[PDB]
Coordinates of all heavy atoms in Angstrom, one line a residue:
Chain D
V11 N -29.1 -4.3 -28.9 CA -28.4 -3.0 -28.8 C -27.0 -3.3 -29.3 O -26.1 -3.7 -28.5 CB -28.4 -2.4 -27.4 CG1 -27.6 -1.1 -27.5 CG2 -29.8 -2.1 -27.0
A12 N -23.0 -6.4 -30.8 CA -24.2 -5.9 -30.0 C -24.5 -6.9 -28.8 O -23.9 -8.0 -28.7 CB -25.4 -5.8 -30.9
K13 N -25.4 -6.5 -28.0 CA -25.8 -7.3 -26.9 C -27.4 -7.4 -26.8 O -28.0 -6.5 -27.3 CB -25.4 -6.8 -25.5 CG -23.9 -6.3 -25.5 CD -22.9 -7.4 -25.6 CE -21.5 -6.8 -25.3 NZ -21.4 -6.3 -23.9
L14 N -27.9 -8.5 -26.2 CA -29.3 -8.5 -25.9 C -29.4 -7.8 -24.5 O -28.7 -8.2 -23.5 CB -29.7 -10.0 -25.7 CG -31.1 -10.1 -25.1 CD1 -32.2 -9.4 -25.8 CD2 -31.4 -11.6 -24.9
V15 N -30.1 -6.7 -24.5 CA -30.3 -5.9 -23.3 C -31.6 -6.1 -22.6 O -32.6 -5.9 -23.3 CB -29.9 -4.4 -23.7 CG1 -30.0 -3.5 -22.4 CG2 -28.6 -4.3 -24.3
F16 N -31.7 -6.4 -21.3 CA -33.0 -6.6 -20.7 C -33.3 -5.2 -19.9 O -32.9 -5.0 -18.8 CB -33.0 -7.6 -19.7 CG -33.1 -9.0 -20.5 CD1 -31.9 -9.8 -20.5 CD2 -34.2 -9.3 -21.2 CE1 -32.0 -11.0 -21.2 CE2 -34.3 -10.4 -21.9 CZ -33.2 -11.4 -21.9
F17 N -34.1 -4.4 -20.6 CA -34.5 -3.2 -20.1 C -35.7 -3.4 -19.0 O -36.6 -4.1 -19.3 CB -35.0 -2.2 -21.1 CG -34.0 -1.7 -22.1 CD1 -33.6 -2.3 -23.2 CD2 -33.4 -0.5 -21.7 CE1 -32.6 -1.8 -24.1 CE2 -32.4 0.1 -22.6 CZ -32.0 -0.6 -23.7
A18 N -35.5 -2.8 -17.9 CA -36.5 -3.0 -16.8 C -37.1 -1.6 -16.4 O -36.3 -0.7 -16.0 CB -35.7 -3.6 -15.6
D19 N -38.3 -1.5 -16.4 CA -39.1 -0.5 -15.8 C -40.3 -1.1 -15.1 O -41.2 -1.6 -15.7 CB -39.6 0.5 -16.8 CG -38.4 1.3 -17.4 OD1 -37.6 1.8 -16.7 OD2 -38.4 1.5 -18.7
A20 N -42.3 -6.0 -12.2 CA -42.3 -5.2 -13.5 C -42.2 -6.2 -14.7 O -42.1 -7.4 -14.5 CB -41.0 -4.3 -13.6
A21 N -42.2 -5.7 -15.9 CA -42.2 -6.4 -17.2 C -40.8 -6.0 -17.8 O -40.5 -4.8 -18.0 CB -43.3 -6.1 -18.0
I22 N -40.1 -7.0 -18.2 CA -38.8 -6.8 -18.8 C -38.9 -6.9 -20.3 O -39.7 -7.7 -20.8 CB -37.7 -7.8 -18.2 CG1 -37.1 -7.3 -16.9 CG2 -36.6 -8.0 -19.2 CD1 -38.1 -7.2 -15.8
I23 N -38.1 -6.0 -21.0 CA -38.1 -6.0 -22.5 C -36.7 -6.2 -22.9 O -35.8 -5.4 -22.6 CB -38.7 -4.6 -23.0 CG1 -40.2 -4.5 -22.5 CG2 -38.6 -4.6 -24.5 CD1 -40.7 -3.0 -22.6
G24 N -36.5 -7.3 -23.7 CA -35.2 -7.6 -24.2 C -35.1 -7.2 -25.6 O -35.9 -7.4 -26.5
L25 N -34.0 -6.4 -25.9 CA -33.8 -5.8 -27.2 C -32.3 -5.9 -27.5 O -31.5 -5.7 -26.7 CB -34.2 -4.4 -27.1 CG -35.7 -4.1 -27.2 CD1 -35.9 -2.6 -26.8 CD2 -36.3 -4.4 -28.5
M26 N -32.0 -6.2 -28.8 CA -30.6 -6.2 -29.3 C -30.2 -4.7 -29.5 O -30.9 -4.1 -30.3 CB -30.5 -7.1 -30.5 CG -30.9 -8.6 -30.2 SD -30.6 -9.7 -31.6 CE -32.1 -9.4 -32.6
Chain Z
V17 N -31.1 -3.0 -11.6 CA -30.1 -1.9 -11.4 C -30.5 -0.8 -12.3 O -30.2 -0.7 -13.5 CB -28.7 -2.4 -11.8 CG1 -27.7 -1.2 -11.6 CG2 -28.3 -3.6 -10.9
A18 N -33.6 1.6 -15.9 CA -32.8 0.5 -15.3 C -32.7 -0.7 -16.2 O -33.4 -0.8 -17.2 CB -33.4 0.1 -13.9
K19 N -31.8 -1.7 -15.7 CA -31.7 -3.0 -16.5 C -31.8 -4.1 -15.5 O -31.5 -4.0 -14.3 CB -30.3 -3.1 -17.2 CG -29.8 -1.8 -17.9 CD -30.6 -1.5 -19.1 CE -29.9 -0.4 -19.9 NZ -28.6 -0.8 -20.4
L20 N -32.2 -5.3 -16.1 CA -32.0 -6.5 -15.4 C -30.6 -6.9 -15.5 O -30.2 -7.1 -16.7 CB -33.0 -7.6 -15.8 CG -32.8 -9.0 -15.3 CD1 -32.8 -9.1 -13.8 CD2 -33.8 -10.0 -16.0
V21 N -29.8 -7.1 -14.4 CA -28.4 -7.5 -14.5 C -28.2 -8.9 -14.0 O -28.6 -9.2 -12.9 CB -27.6 -6.4 -13.7 CG1 -26.1 -6.6 -13.8 CG2 -27.9 -4.9 -14.3
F22 N -27.5 -9.7 -14.8 CA -27.3 -11.1 -14.4 C -25.9 -11.1 -13.8 O -24.8 -11.3 -14.5 CB -27.4 -12.0 -15.4 CG -28.9 -12.3 -15.7 CD1 -29.5 -11.9 -16.9 CD2 -29.7 -12.9 -14.7 CE1 -30.8 -12.1 -17.2 CE2 -31.0 -13.0 -15.0 CZ -31.6 -12.6 -16.2
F23 N -25.8 -11.0 -12.5 CA -24.5 -11.0 -11.7 C -24.0 -12.5 -11.6 O -24.8 -13.4 -11.3 CB -24.7 -10.5 -10.3 CG -24.8 -8.9 -10.3 CD1 -26.0 -8.4 -10.3 CD2 -23.7 -8.2 -10.3 CE1 -26.2 -7.0 -10.2 CE2 -23.8 -6.8 -10.2 CZ -25.1 -6.2 -10.2
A24 N -22.8 -12.7 -11.9 CA -22.2 -14.0 -12.0 C -21.0 -14.1 -11.1 O -20.0 -13.3 -11.2 CB -21.8 -14.4 -13.4
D25 N -21.1 -15.0 -10.1 CA -19.9 -15.4 -9.3 C -20.0 -17.0 -9.3 O -20.8 -17.5 -8.5 CB -19.9 -14.8 -8.0 CG -19.7 -13.3 -8.0 OD1 -18.8 -12.9 -8.6 OD2 -20.5 -12.6 -7.3
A26 N -21.6 -22.0 -12.1 CA -21.9 -21.0 -11.0 C -23.4 -20.8 -10.9 O -24.2 -21.4 -11.7 CB -21.2 -19.7 -11.3
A27 N -23.9 -19.9 -10.0 CA -25.3 -19.6 -9.8 C -25.4 -18.1 -10.2 O -24.7 -17.3 -9.6 CB -25.9 -19.9 -8.5
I28 N -26.4 -17.8 -11.0 CA -26.5 -16.4 -11.5 C -27.6 -15.8 -10.8 O -28.6 -16.4 -10.4 CB -26.8 -16.4 -13.0 CG1 -25.4 -16.4 -13.8 CG2 -27.5 -15.2 -13.4 CD1 -24.7 -17.7 -13.7
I29 N -27.5 -14.5 -10.4 CA -28.4 -13.7 -9.7 C -28.8 -12.5 -10.5 O -28.0 -11.6 -10.9 CB -27.9 -13.2 -8.3 CG1 -27.5 -14.5 -7.5 CG2 -28.9 -12.4 -7.6 CD1 -26.6 -14.2 -6.3
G30 N -30.1 -12.5 -10.9 CA -30.7 -11.4 -11.7 C -31.3 -10.3 -10.8 O -32.1 -10.6 -9.9
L31 N -30.9 -9.1 -11.0 CA -31.3 -8.0 -10.1 C -31.5 -6.7 -11.0 O -30.7 -6.5 -12.0 CB -30.3 -7.7 -9.1 CG -30.2 -8.6 -7.9 CD1 -28.9 -8.3 -7.1 CD2 -31.4 -8.5 -7.0
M32 N -32.6 -6.0 -10.7 CA -32.8 -4.8 -11.5 C -32.0 -3.7 -10.8 O -32.1 -3.5 -9.6 CB -34.3 -4.5 -11.4 CG -35.2 -5.5 -12.1 SD -37.0 -5.1 -12.1 CE -37.6 -5.5 -10.5
Chain I
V13 N -44.1 -16.0 -14.3 CA -45.1 -17.1 -14.5 C -44.9 -18.1 -13.3 O -44.0 -18.9 -13.5 CB -45.0 -17.7 -15.8 CG1 -46.1 -18.9 -15.9 CG2 -45.2 -16.7 -17.0
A14 N -42.3 -20.0 -9.1 CA -42.5 -19.5 -10.6 C -41.1 -19.3 -11.2 O -40.1 -19.5 -10.7 CB -43.2 -18.1 -10.4
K15 N -41.2 -18.9 -12.6 CA -40.0 -18.7 -13.4 C -40.2 -17.3 -14.1 O -41.3 -16.8 -14.4 CB -39.9 -19.7 -14.5 CG -40.1 -21.2 -14.1 CD -39.1 -21.7 -13.1 CE -39.3 -23.2 -13.0 NZ -39.0 -24.0 -14.2
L16 N -39.0 -16.7 -14.4 CA -39.0 -15.6 -15.4 C -39.0 -16.2 -16.8 O -38.2 -17.0 -17.1 CB -37.7 -14.8 -15.2 CG -37.5 -13.8 -16.2 CD1 -38.6 -12.8 -16.4 CD2 -36.1 -13.1 -16.0
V17 N -40.0 -15.9 -17.5 CA -40.3 -16.5 -18.8 C -40.0 -15.4 -19.9 O -40.6 -14.3 -19.9 CB -41.7 -17.1 -18.9 CG1 -42.0 -17.7 -20.3 CG2 -42.0 -18.0 -17.8
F18 N -39.2 -15.7 -20.9 CA -38.9 -14.8 -22.0 C -39.8 -15.1 -23.2 O -39.4 -16.0 -24.0 CB -37.5 -14.7 -22.4 CG -36.7 -14.0 -21.3 CD1 -35.8 -14.7 -20.5 CD2 -36.9 -12.7 -21.1 CE1 -35.1 -14.1 -19.5 CE2 -36.2 -12.0 -20.1 CZ -35.3 -12.7 -19.3
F19 N -40.9 -14.5 -23.3 CA -41.8 -14.7 -24.3 C -41.3 -14.0 -25.6 O -40.9 -12.8 -25.6 CB -43.2 -14.1 -24.0 CG -44.0 -14.9 -23.0 CD1 -43.9 -14.6 -21.7 CD2 -44.8 -15.9 -23.4 CE1 -44.6 -15.3 -20.7 CE2 -45.5 -16.7 -22.5 CZ -45.4 -16.4 -21.1
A20 N -41.3 -14.7 -26.7 CA -40.8 -14.2 -28.0 C -41.8 -14.2 -29.1 O -42.5 -15.2 -29.3 CB -39.6 -15.1 -28.4
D21 N -42.1 -13.0 -29.6 CA -42.9 -12.9 -30.8 C -42.1 -12.0 -31.8 O -42.2 -10.8 -31.5 CB -44.3 -12.5 -30.6 CG -45.2 -13.5 -29.9 OD1 -45.1 -14.7 -30.3 OD2 -45.8 -13.2 -28.9
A22 N -36.8 -9.7 -33.3 CA -38.0 -9.5 -32.5 C -37.7 -8.8 -31.2 O -36.6 -8.6 -30.8 CB -38.8 -10.9 -32.2
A23 N -38.8 -8.5 -30.3 CA -38.6 -7.9 -29.0 C -39.1 -9.0 -28.0 O -40.2 -9.6 -28.2 CB -39.4 -6.6 -28.9
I24 N -38.3 -9.2 -27.0 CA -38.6 -10.2 -26.0 C -39.2 -9.6 -24.8 O -38.9 -8.5 -24.5 CB -37.3 -11.0 -25.7 CG1 -37.1 -12.2 -26.7 CG2 -37.4 -11.7 -24.3 CD1 -36.8 -11.7 -28.1
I25 N -40.2 -10.3 -24.2 CA -40.9 -9.7 -23.0 C -40.7 -10.8 -21.9 O -41.1 -11.9 -22.0 CB -42.3 -9.5 -23.3 CG1 -42.5 -8.5 -24.4 CG2 -43.1 -9.1 -22.1 CD1 -43.9 -8.4 -25.0
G26 N -40.1 -10.4 -20.8 CA -39.8 -11.3 -19.7 C -40.9 -11.0 -18.6 O -41.1 -9.8 -18.2
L27 N -41.5 -12.1 -18.1 CA -42.6 -12.0 -17.3 C -42.5 -13.2 -16.2 O -42.1 -14.3 -16.7 CB -43.9 -12.1 -18.0 CG -44.4 -10.9 -18.7 CD1 -45.6 -11.2 -19.6 CD2 -44.7 -9.7 -17.8
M28 N -42.7 -12.9 -15.0 CA -42.7 -13.9 -14.0 C -44.1 -14.6 -14.1 O -45.1 -14.0 -14.0 CB -42.5 -13.3 -12.6 CG -41.1 -12.7 -12.5 SD -40.7 -12.0 -10.8 CE -41.6 -10.5 -10.7
Chain V
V11 N -30.3 -26.7 -15.2 CA -31.2 -27.8 -15.0 C -31.2 -28.7 -16.3 O -31.9 -28.4 -17.3 CB -32.7 -27.3 -14.8 CG1 -33.6 -28.6 -14.6 CG2 -32.8 -26.5 -13.6
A12 N -29.6 -29.8 -21.2 CA -30.1 -28.9 -20.1 C -30.4 -27.5 -20.5 O -30.1 -27.1 -21.7 CB -29.1 -28.9 -18.9
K13 N -31.0 -26.7 -19.6 CA -31.4 -25.3 -19.8 C -30.9 -24.5 -18.7 O -30.8 -24.9 -17.5 CB -32.8 -25.1 -20.0 CG -33.6 -26.1 -20.8 CD -33.2 -26.1 -22.3 CE -34.3 -27.0 -23.1 NZ -35.7 -26.5 -23.0
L14 N -30.6 -23.2 -19.0 CA -30.5 -22.2 -17.9 C -31.9 -21.8 -17.5 O -32.7 -21.3 -18.4 CB -29.7 -21.0 -18.4 CG -29.7 -19.8 -17.5 CD1 -29.1 -20.2 -16.1 CD2 -28.9 -18.7 -18.1
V15 N -32.3 -22.0 -16.2 CA -33.6 -21.8 -15.7 C -33.6 -20.5 -14.8 O -32.8 -20.5 -13.9 CB -34.1 -23.0 -15.0 CG1 -35.6 -22.8 -14.5 CG2 -34.1 -24.2 -16.0
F16 N -34.4 -19.5 -15.1 CA -34.5 -18.3 -14.2 C -35.6 -18.5 -13.2 O -36.8 -18.2 -13.5 CB -34.6 -17.1 -14.9 CG -33.3 -16.7 -15.6 CD1 -33.2 -16.8 -17.0 CD2 -32.2 -16.4 -14.8 CE1 -32.0 -16.5 -17.6 CE2 -31.0 -16.1 -15.4 CZ -30.9 -16.1 -16.8
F17 N -35.3 -19.0 -12.1 CA -36.2 -19.2 -11.0 C -36.6 -17.9 -10.3 O -35.7 -17.1 -10.0 CB -35.6 -20.2 -9.9 CG -35.6 -21.6 -10.3 CD1 -34.5 -22.1 -10.9 CD2 -36.7 -22.5 -10.2 CE1 -34.4 -23.5 -11.3 CE2 -36.6 -23.8 -10.5 CZ -35.4 -24.3 -11.1
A18 N -37.9 -17.7 -10.1 CA -38.4 -16.4 -9.6 C -39.2 -16.6 -8.4 O -40.1 -17.3 -8.4 CB -39.2 -15.7 -10.7
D19 N -38.7 -16.0 -7.3 CA -39.6 -15.9 -6.1 C -39.4 -14.5 -5.6 O -38.4 -14.1 -5.0 CB -39.1 -16.9 -5.0 CG -39.5 -18.4 -5.3 OD1 -40.6 -18.6 -5.8 OD2 -38.6 -19.2 -5.2
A20 N -38.6 -8.7 -7.2 CA -38.0 -10.0 -6.6 C -36.5 -10.1 -7.1 O -36.0 -9.4 -8.0 CB -38.7 -11.3 -7.1
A21 N -35.8 -11.2 -6.7 CA -34.4 -11.5 -7.1 C -34.5 -12.9 -7.9 O -35.1 -13.8 -7.4 CB -33.5 -11.6 -6.0
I22 N -34.0 -12.9 -9.0 CA -34.0 -14.1 -9.9 C -32.7 -14.8 -9.8 O -31.7 -14.3 -9.6 CB -34.3 -13.7 -11.4 CG1 -35.8 -13.5 -11.6 CG2 -33.7 -14.6 -12.3 CD1 -36.4 -12.3 -10.9
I23 N -32.9 -16.2 -9.8 CA -31.7 -17.1 -9.6 C -31.7 -18.0 -10.8 O -32.6 -18.7 -11.1 CB -31.9 -17.9 -8.3 CG1 -31.8 -17.0 -7.1 CG2 -30.7 -18.9 -8.2 CD1 -32.3 -17.6 -5.8
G24 N -30.6 -17.9 -11.5 CA -30.4 -18.7 -12.8 C -29.6 -19.9 -12.5 O -28.5 -19.8 -11.9
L25 N -30.0 -21.0 -12.9 CA -29.4 -22.3 -12.6 C -29.5 -23.2 -13.8 O -30.6 -23.3 -14.4 CB -30.1 -22.9 -11.4 CG -29.7 -22.3 -10.0 CD1 -30.7 -22.9 -9.0 CD2 -28.3 -22.6 -9.6
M26 N -28.5 -23.9 -14.1 CA -28.6 -25.0 -15.2 C -29.2 -26.2 -14.6 O -28.7 -26.8 -13.6 CB -27.1 -25.2 -15.7 CG -26.5 -24.0 -16.3 SD -24.8 -24.3 -17.0 CE -23.8 -24.3 -15.6
Chain P
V17 N -18.3 -12.8 -18.2 CA -17.4 -11.7 -18.4 C -17.2 -11.1 -17.0 O -17.9 -10.3 -16.6 CB -17.8 -10.7 -19.4 CG1 -16.8 -9.5 -19.5 CG2 -18.1 -11.4 -20.7
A18 N -18.1 -10.4 -11.9 CA -18.4 -10.6 -13.3 C -20.0 -10.6 -13.6 O -20.8 -10.7 -12.7 CB -17.8 -12.0 -13.8
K19 N -20.3 -10.7 -14.9 CA -21.7 -10.7 -15.4 C -21.9 -11.8 -16.4 O -20.9 -12.1 -17.2 CB -22.2 -9.4 -16.0 CG -21.7 -8.1 -15.3 CD -22.4 -7.9 -13.9 CE -22.1 -6.6 -13.4 NZ -22.6 -5.5 -14.3
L20 N -23.1 -12.4 -16.5 CA -23.5 -13.2 -17.6 C -23.9 -12.2 -18.7 O -24.8 -11.3 -18.6 CB -24.6 -14.1 -17.2 CG -25.3 -14.8 -18.4 CD1 -24.3 -15.6 -19.3 CD2 -26.5 -15.6 -18.0
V21 N -23.2 -12.2 -19.9 CA -23.4 -11.3 -21.0 C -24.0 -12.0 -22.2 O -23.5 -13.0 -22.6 CB -22.0 -10.6 -21.3 CG1 -22.2 -9.6 -22.4 CG2 -21.3 -10.0 -20.1
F22 N -25.1 -11.5 -22.7 CA -25.8 -12.0 -23.7 C -25.3 -11.4 -25.1 O -25.9 -10.3 -25.5 CB -27.2 -12.0 -23.7 CG -27.7 -13.1 -22.7 CD1 -28.3 -12.7 -21.5 CD2 -27.5 -14.5 -23.0 CE1 -28.6 -13.7 -20.5 CE2 -27.9 -15.4 -22.0 CZ -28.5 -15.0 -20.8
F23 N -24.3 -11.9 -25.7 CA -23.7 -11.4 -26.9 C -24.7 -11.7 -28.1 O -25.1 -12.9 -28.2 CB -22.4 -12.0 -27.2 CG -21.3 -11.5 -26.3 CD1 -20.9 -12.1 -25.2 CD2 -20.6 -10.3 -26.7 CE1 -19.9 -11.6 -24.4 CE2 -19.6 -9.8 -25.9 CZ -19.2 -10.5 -24.7
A24 N -25.0 -10.7 -28.9 CA -25.9 -10.9 -30.0 C -25.3 -10.5 -31.3 O -24.8 -9.4 -31.5 CB -27.2 -10.0 -29.8
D25 N -25.3 -11.5 -32.2 CA -24.9 -11.2 -33.6 C -26.0 -11.9 -34.5 O -25.9 -13.1 -34.6 CB -23.5 -11.7 -34.0 CG -22.5 -10.8 -33.3 OD1 -22.6 -9.5 -33.3 OD2 -21.6 -11.4 -32.8
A26 N -31.6 -13.9 -34.8 CA -30.2 -14.3 -34.5 C -30.1 -15.3 -33.4 O -31.1 -15.7 -32.8 CB -29.4 -13.0 -34.1
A27 N -28.8 -15.7 -33.1 CA -28.6 -16.7 -32.0 C -27.8 -16.0 -31.0 O -26.8 -15.3 -31.3 CB -27.9 -17.9 -32.5
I28 N -28.2 -16.0 -29.7 CA -27.6 -15.3 -28.6 C -26.7 -16.3 -27.9 O -26.9 -17.5 -27.8 CB -28.6 -14.7 -27.7 CG1 -29.1 -13.4 -28.2 CG2 -28.1 -14.5 -26.3 CD1 -29.9 -13.4 -29.5
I29 N -25.5 -15.7 -27.5 CA -24.5 -16.5 -26.8 C -24.2 -15.9 -25.5 O -23.8 -14.7 -25.4 CB -23.1 -16.6 -27.6 CG1 -23.4 -17.3 -28.9 CG2 -22.1 -17.3 -26.8 CD1 -22.4 -17.2 -30.0
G30 N -24.5 -16.6 -24.4 CA -24.3 -16.1 -23.0 C -23.0 -16.6 -22.5 O -22.7 -17.8 -22.5
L31 N -22.3 -15.6 -22.0 CA -20.9 -15.9 -21.5 C -20.6 -15.1 -20.2 O -21.0 -13.9 -20.2 CB -19.8 -15.6 -22.6 CG -19.7 -16.5 -23.8 CD1 -18.9 -15.9 -24.8 CD2 -19.1 -17.8 -23.3
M32 N -20.0 -15.7 -19.3 CA -19.6 -15.0 -18.1 C -18.3 -14.2 -18.4 O -17.3 -14.8 -18.8 CB -19.4 -15.9 -16.9 CG -20.7 -16.7 -16.5 SD -20.6 -17.8 -15.1 CE -19.8 -19.2 -15.7
Chain R
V2 N -37.7 -20.7 -29.9 CA -38.5 -22.0 -29.9 C -40.0 -21.7 -29.8 O -40.5 -21.5 -28.7 CB -38.0 -22.9 -28.8 CG1 -38.9 -24.2 -28.9 CG2 -36.6 -23.3 -28.9
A3 N -44.0 -18.4 -29.0 CA -42.7 -19.0 -28.8 C -42.0 -18.4 -27.6 O -42.5 -17.4 -27.0 CB -41.8 -18.8 -30.1
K4 N -40.8 -19.0 -27.2 CA -40.0 -18.5 -26.1 C -38.6 -18.4 -26.5 O -38.1 -19.1 -27.4 CB -40.1 -19.4 -24.9 CG -41.4 -20.0 -24.6 CD -42.4 -19.0 -24.0 CE -43.6 -19.7 -23.4 NZ -43.3 -20.5 -22.3
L5 N -37.9 -17.4 -25.9 CA -36.4 -17.5 -26.0 C -35.9 -18.5 -25.0 O -36.2 -18.5 -23.7 CB -35.9 -16.1 -25.6 CG -34.3 -16.1 -25.4 CD1 -33.6 -16.5 -26.7 CD2 -33.9 -14.6 -25.0
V6 N -35.2 -19.5 -25.5 CA -34.8 -20.7 -24.7 C -33.3 -20.6 -24.5 O -32.5 -20.5 -25.5 CB -35.3 -22.0 -25.3 CG1 -34.8 -23.2 -24.5 CG2 -36.8 -22.0 -25.6
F7 N -32.8 -20.7 -23.2 CA -31.3 -20.6 -23.0 C -30.8 -22.1 -22.8 O -30.9 -22.6 -21.7 CB -30.9 -19.8 -21.9 CG -31.0 -18.3 -22.2 CD1 -32.1 -17.6 -21.6 CD2 -30.2 -17.8 -23.2 CE1 -32.2 -16.3 -21.9 CE2 -30.3 -16.5 -23.5 CZ -31.3 -15.7 -22.9
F8 N -30.3 -22.6 -23.9 CA -29.8 -24.0 -24.0 C -28.4 -24.0 -23.3 O -27.6 -23.2 -23.7 CB -29.8 -24.5 -25.4 CG -31.0 -24.9 -26.0 CD1 -31.7 -24.0 -26.8 CD2 -31.6 -26.1 -25.8 CE1 -32.9 -24.3 -27.3 CE2 -32.8 -26.5 -26.4 CZ -33.5 -25.6 -27.1
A9 N -28.2 -24.9 -22.4 CA -27.0 -25.0 -21.6 C -26.3 -26.4 -21.8 O -26.9 -27.4 -21.5 CB -27.2 -24.8 -20.1
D10 N -25.1 -26.4 -22.3 CA -24.2 -27.5 -22.3 C -22.9 -27.1 -21.8 O -22.1 -26.5 -22.6 CB -24.2 -28.2 -23.7 CG -25.5 -28.9 -24.1 OD1 -26.1 -29.6 -23.3 OD2 -25.9 -28.7 -25.2
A11 N -19.8 -23.2 -18.5 CA -20.3 -23.4 -19.9 C -20.7 -22.2 -20.7 O -20.7 -21.1 -20.2 CB -21.5 -24.4 -19.8
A12 N -21.1 -22.4 -22.0 CA -21.5 -21.3 -22.8 C -23.0 -21.5 -23.1 O -23.4 -22.6 -23.6 CB -20.7 -21.2 -24.2
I13 N -23.8 -20.5 -23.0 CA -25.2 -20.7 -23.2 C -25.6 -20.1 -24.5 O -25.0 -19.2 -25.0 CB -26.0 -19.9 -22.0 CG1 -26.1 -20.8 -20.8 CG2 -27.3 -19.5 -22.4 CD1 -24.9 -21.1 -20.0
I14 N -26.6 -20.8 -25.1 CA -27.1 -20.5 -26.5 C -28.5 -20.2 -26.4 O -29.3 -21.1 -26.0 CB -26.8 -21.6 -27.5 CG1 -25.3 -21.8 -27.6 CG2 -27.3 -21.2 -28.8 CD1 -24.9 -23.1 -28.2
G15 N -28.9 -18.9 -26.7 CA -30.3 -18.5 -26.7 C -30.9 -18.6 -28.0 O -30.4 -18.0 -29.0
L16 N -32.0 -19.2 -28.1 CA -32.7 -19.5 -29.3 C -34.2 -19.4 -29.2 O -34.7 -19.9 -28.2 CB -32.4 -20.9 -29.9 CG -31.0 -21.0 -30.5 CD1 -30.7 -22.6 -30.7 CD2 -30.8 -20.4 -31.8
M17 N -34.9 -18.7 -30.1 CA -36.3 -18.7 -30.1 C -36.9 -20.0 -30.7 O -36.5 -20.4 -31.8 CB -36.8 -17.5 -31.0 CG -36.3 -16.1 -30.4 SD -36.9 -14.7 -31.3 CE -35.9 -14.6 -32.7

């Protein structure tokens, strides 16, 4: 997203 | 916290 | 997996 | 631990 | 930066 | 490296 963002909804999804 | 947040005060604590 | 493992194939998937 | 290791037992603890 | 921040420009750089 | 590996020598360097 820059930053590596660890989206959490568990299983985490890392996205720039 | 959503996001996985790596709180830093070292030893890091990851919390949603 | 314990550890939080950041699987990479990009979009990263974090799994215990 | 080098590597930053995310120990999981949740609340994650990151340690070199 | 507190938080551990994963700066992304790839190779990621983690900084408090 | 697959996995995202957080190499620690601090400033952390994340590399697949």
Side-chain angles (χ1 to χ4, degrees):
Chain D
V11 180
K13 317 291 190 63
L14 170 59
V15 181
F16 285 110
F17 287 94
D19 290 314
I22 274 71
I23 297 163
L25 285 168
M26 297 184 282
Chain Z
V17 180
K19 317 291 190 63
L20 170 59
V21 181
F22 285 110
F23 287 94
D25 290 314
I28 274 71
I29 297 163
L31 285 168
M32 297 184 282
Chain I
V13 180
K15 317 291 190 63
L16 170 59
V17 181
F18 285 110
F19 287 94
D21 290 314
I24 274 71
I25 297 163
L27 285 168
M28 297 184 282
Chain V
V11 180
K13 317 291 190 63
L14 170 59
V15 181
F16 285 110
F17 287 94
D19 290 314
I22 274 71
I23 297 163
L25 285 168
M26 297 184 282
Chain P
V17 180
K19 317 291 190 63
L20 170 59
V21 181
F22 285 110
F23 287 94
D25 290 314
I28 274 71
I29 297 163
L31 285 168
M32 297 184 282
Chain R
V2 180
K4 317 291 190 63
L5 170 59
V6 181
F7 285 110
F8 287 94
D10 290 314
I13 274 71
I14 297 163
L16 285 168
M17 297 184 282

